[PDB]
Structure 1
Amino acid sequence: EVQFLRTDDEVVLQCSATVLKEQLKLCLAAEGFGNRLCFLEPTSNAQNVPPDLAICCFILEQSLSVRALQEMLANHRTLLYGHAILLRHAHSRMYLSCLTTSRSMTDKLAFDVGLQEDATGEACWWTMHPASKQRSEGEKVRVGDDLILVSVSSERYLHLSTASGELQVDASFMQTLWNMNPICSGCEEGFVTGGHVLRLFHGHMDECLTISPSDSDDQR
């Protein structure tokens, strides 16, 4: 069976690089508070070192056609190729956006990618385009598809940059293939799901599992 992405779903944006001839998968991550810039969190070595996935999760708030988005700016739906999407950081609740600044020494035409507090303007909207002829515009986006994100405001691709020593993410005129891997779609009410933050109580004795307070002698 084929699964389609829908609004209000949680996703991770994943890209692939080749480092020492070994495939490495990376997820787009951002802290939001104290640092709005997006970076890449590797996820290929998860069996040895767990990745920091709490900050890699994005919710698909809206999906509109370009004309509808233009009308809205002038003023659960399935995603379709050629639509514009709005991605909200799950942790900070900011919005993925193409920034006007740039800290890239290698590329003069590139822009920084980060989070912005509000969803106003066209800087926080991205258009999805198929990576291959297998898919066509207006076709529903299927889980595991390869797509290209184009910034509406800057017309630049969400691009993986390897020019420097390390792997960075920016908005440039060179394209990169991204996977919108689903994390959760809809939780049956009252049921536990992975990635949730909770407390583990000792039965019902009102005792919880915890660590020692800060500055404790046991090093927490």
Structure 2
Amino acid sequence: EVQFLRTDDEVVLQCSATVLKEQLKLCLAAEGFGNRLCFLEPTSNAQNVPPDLAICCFTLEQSLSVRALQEMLANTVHRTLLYGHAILLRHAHSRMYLSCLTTSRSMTDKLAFDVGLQEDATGEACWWTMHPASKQRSEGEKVRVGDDLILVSVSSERYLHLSTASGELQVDASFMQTLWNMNPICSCCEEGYVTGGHVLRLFHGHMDECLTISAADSDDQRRLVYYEGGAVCTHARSLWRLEPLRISWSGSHLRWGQPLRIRHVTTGRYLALTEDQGLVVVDACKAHTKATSFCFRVSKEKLDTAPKRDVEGMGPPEIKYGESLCFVQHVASGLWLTYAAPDPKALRLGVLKKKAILHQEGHMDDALFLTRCQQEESQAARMIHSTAGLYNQFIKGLDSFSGKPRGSGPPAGPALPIEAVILSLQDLIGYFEPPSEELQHEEKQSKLRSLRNRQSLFQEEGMLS
């Protein structure tokens, strides 16, 4: 029917651009404690590249009128929304705010006003309002799903447009009009039901072993996928993110038979079967939906037949977190990925050291139950992944030239992100700041416990060598 669109639902901004003679759709994404500059990623053309639907989601908090917002700003110290009201946009990764910076770029001068992210919510160029885009409807009416929208800041009455200069798909803020499509993803949270786009901790047995990858700086690459016991049960290495490929409401219930893309939250890779070495981890280059897709089913029967349950709504209730077991099988290959354990070797005497290999026979022991992952743990894991990627890029750029002490022009190849890495270390310093001694003892103990947990989850991933 008509989407309710509550003021507490996940919203992903998107727009359509034609620069390659194609009417594809591009969304807006921004990283966390890094370069505060919005960047675009291919989300409509997901068949060849994997779209990252993790740093592009935003959350609505408040919806007030212009005069009410002005009154609130003048004196600082699930309802619906109307058409032509102030709308907040809070980042769902680490609780940022969509703001406009007073900078200039793109070699355009005049009026650039580059957009970015803000740490606080003091106001000014932080809120955004809606305006009539299509003549079908006017102000004062219910906001409909899709059908394009216009986002304008309150303090700076500027639109959101693209870049027509040499810069490839740069979001700027000027006075030209550019339609922006609306594509909601998630809805109000349930009482413990499986939701797409949420990280999960896969478990094996009851409380003995889990599924993860070996630690870094090993004898080879991290494409082994072993079966470690309780050592990494509470560690960030055993974390998986699932996202369907569809552009539709990914926040609905993760019903059986839906295409699943298992994405590593630490290496930024995907798990699939290449039919060449077994259960290996594939990068973002070879992104084929034939082998990278997975599905859920009940028991160990096929019962696939004709496709079913292609509805747009939330969907029927399903398995809760830790209620019962689940079975994972390939969508095309149709094999079970349960462990084998042929013979316990005396070389790798790591208590539970079993390789994960898929076979048709199985072992009647696909005991996997879903477990909820904490928001802090997922945010920390995303921070480690992005930070390690930045340092890998930095060391690669430094090692690109090692034996050319000639000068004669500092430009010699790829550039380096000096400002971005400086801001990243400054943000990391501001994040790992131990609290001072002026609050209650229980709050201090909780803060130290959280800091110790962050440091331990940091050290398990390492990034010290």
What TM-score do the two structures reach when normalised by structure 1?
0.94
Q: Is the 8 A contact 2:58 2:90 kept in 1?
A: yes
Task: Tell me the CA shift for residue 4 of structure 1.
Answer: 2.9
Task: Tell me the CA shift for residue 111 of structure 1.
Answer: 0.9
Task: Tell me the CA shift for residue 92 of structure 1.
Answer: 2.1
Relative to structure 1, the CA distance from residue 177 to residue 206 in structure 2 (aligned partners, 3 Å threshold; closer, same or farther) is farther
RMSD between aligned alpha carbons? 1.4
Distance (whole Å) between structure 1 residues aligned to residue 196 and residue 160 of structure 2 = 28
* 1:30-82 CA distance string (max 9 Å, x none): 11302111111221211221111100000011111101111111111222211
In structure 2, the gaps of 5 or more residues are 221-465
Relative to structure 1, the CA distance from residue 159 to residue 206 in structure 2 (aligned partners, 3 Å threshold; closer, same or farther) is farther
* 1:106-158 CA distance string (max 9 Å, x none): 35212111110011122111111121111211111111121111111211101
Relative to structure 1, the CA distance from residue 164 to residue 80 in structure 2 (aligned partners, 3 Å threshold; closer, same or farther) is farther
Relative to structure 1, the CA distance from residue 192 to residue 66 in structure 2 (aligned partners, 3 Å threshold; closer, same or farther) is same
Distance (whole Å) between structure 2 residues aligned to residue 84 and residue 165 of structure 1 = 30
Distance (whole Å) between structure 2 residues aligned to residue 93 and residue 214 of structure 1 = 29
Q: Is the 8 A contact 1:4 1:79 kept in 2?
A: no
Q: Which has the higher helix share?
A: 2
In structure 1, the gaps of 5 or more residues are none
Distance (whole Å) between structure 1 residues aligned to residue 25 and residue 205 of structure 2 = 40
Relative to structure 1, the CA distance from residue 177 to residue 199 in structure 2 (aligned partners, 3 Å threshold; closer, same or farther) is same
Distance (whole Å) between structure 2 residues aligned to residue 27 and residue 192 of structure 1 = 25
Task: Tell me the CA shift for residue 180 of structure 1.
Answer: 2.5
Q: Is the 8 A contact 2:131 2:149 kept in 1?
A: yes
Task: Tell me the CA shift for residue 18 of structure 1.
Answer: 0.7
Q: Is the 8 A contact 2:106 2:165 kept in 1?
A: no
Task: Tell me the CA shift for residue 83 of structure 1.
Answer: 0.2
Q: Is the 8 A contact 2:10 2:57 kept in 1?
A: yes
SS of corresponding position for 2:41: strand
Equivalent residue for 2:168? 166
Q: Is the 8 A contact 2:103 2:112 kept in 1?
A: no
Relative to structure 1, the CA distance from residue 214 to residue 80 in structure 2 (aligned partners, 3 Å threshold; closer, same or farther) is same
* 1:174-206 CA distance string (max 9 Å, x none): 121112311111121111101101111114243
**What is the total number of aligned residue pairs between the two structures?**
218
Equivalent residue for 1:45? 45
Task: Tell me the CA shift for residue 93 of structure 1.
Answer: 0.7
Q: Is the 8 A contact 2:104 2:114 kept in 1?
A: yes
Equivalent residue for 1:99? 101
Q: Is the 8 A contact 2:16 2:181 kept in 1?
A: no
Distance (whole Å) between structure 2 residues aligned to residue 5 and residue 36 of structure 1 = 28
SS of corresponding position for 1:61: coil
Q: Which has the higher strand share?
A: 1
Distance (whole Å) between structure 2 residues aligned to residue 102 and residue 215 of structure 1 = 42
Equivalent residue for 1:185? 187
Distance (whole Å) between structure 2 residues aligned to residue 203 and residue 183 of structure 1 = 33
What TM-score do the two structures reach when normalised by structure 2?
0.45
- Aligned residues with identical type, % of pairs: 98
Relative to structure 1, the CA distance from residue 158 to residue 135 in structure 2 (aligned partners, 3 Å threshold; closer, same or farther) is same
Q: Is the 8 A contact 1:110 1:173 kept in 2?
A: no
Equivalent residue for 2:5? 5
Relative to structure 1, the CA distance from residue 165 to residue 104 in structure 2 (aligned partners, 3 Å threshold; closer, same or farther) is closer
Q: Is the 8 A contact 1:15 1:160 kept in 2?
A: no
Distance (whole Å) between structure 2 residues aligned to residue 171 and residue 79 of structure 1 = 24
Q: Is the 8 A contact 1:8 1:60 kept in 2?
A: yes
Instruction: Choose between structure 1 and 2 for higher RCO, CA contacts under 8 A separated by at least 6 residues.
Output: 1
Distance (whole Å) between structure 2 residues aligned to residue 206 and residue 171 of structure 1 = 54
Relative to structure 1, the CA distance from residue 107 to residue 44 in structure 2 (aligned partners, 3 Å threshold; closer, same or farther) is farther
Distance (whole Å) between structure 1 residues aligned to residue 110 and residue 94 of structure 2 = 30
Equivalent residue for 2:15? 15
Task: Tell me the CA shift for residue 24 of structure 1.
Answer: 2.2
Larger radius of gyration: 2
Distance (whole Å) between structure 2 residues aligned to residue 89 and residue 83 of structure 1 = 19
Distance (whole Å) between structure 2 residues aligned to residue 7 and residue 142 of structure 1 = 13
Q: Is the 8 A contact 1:122 1:153 kept in 2?
A: yes
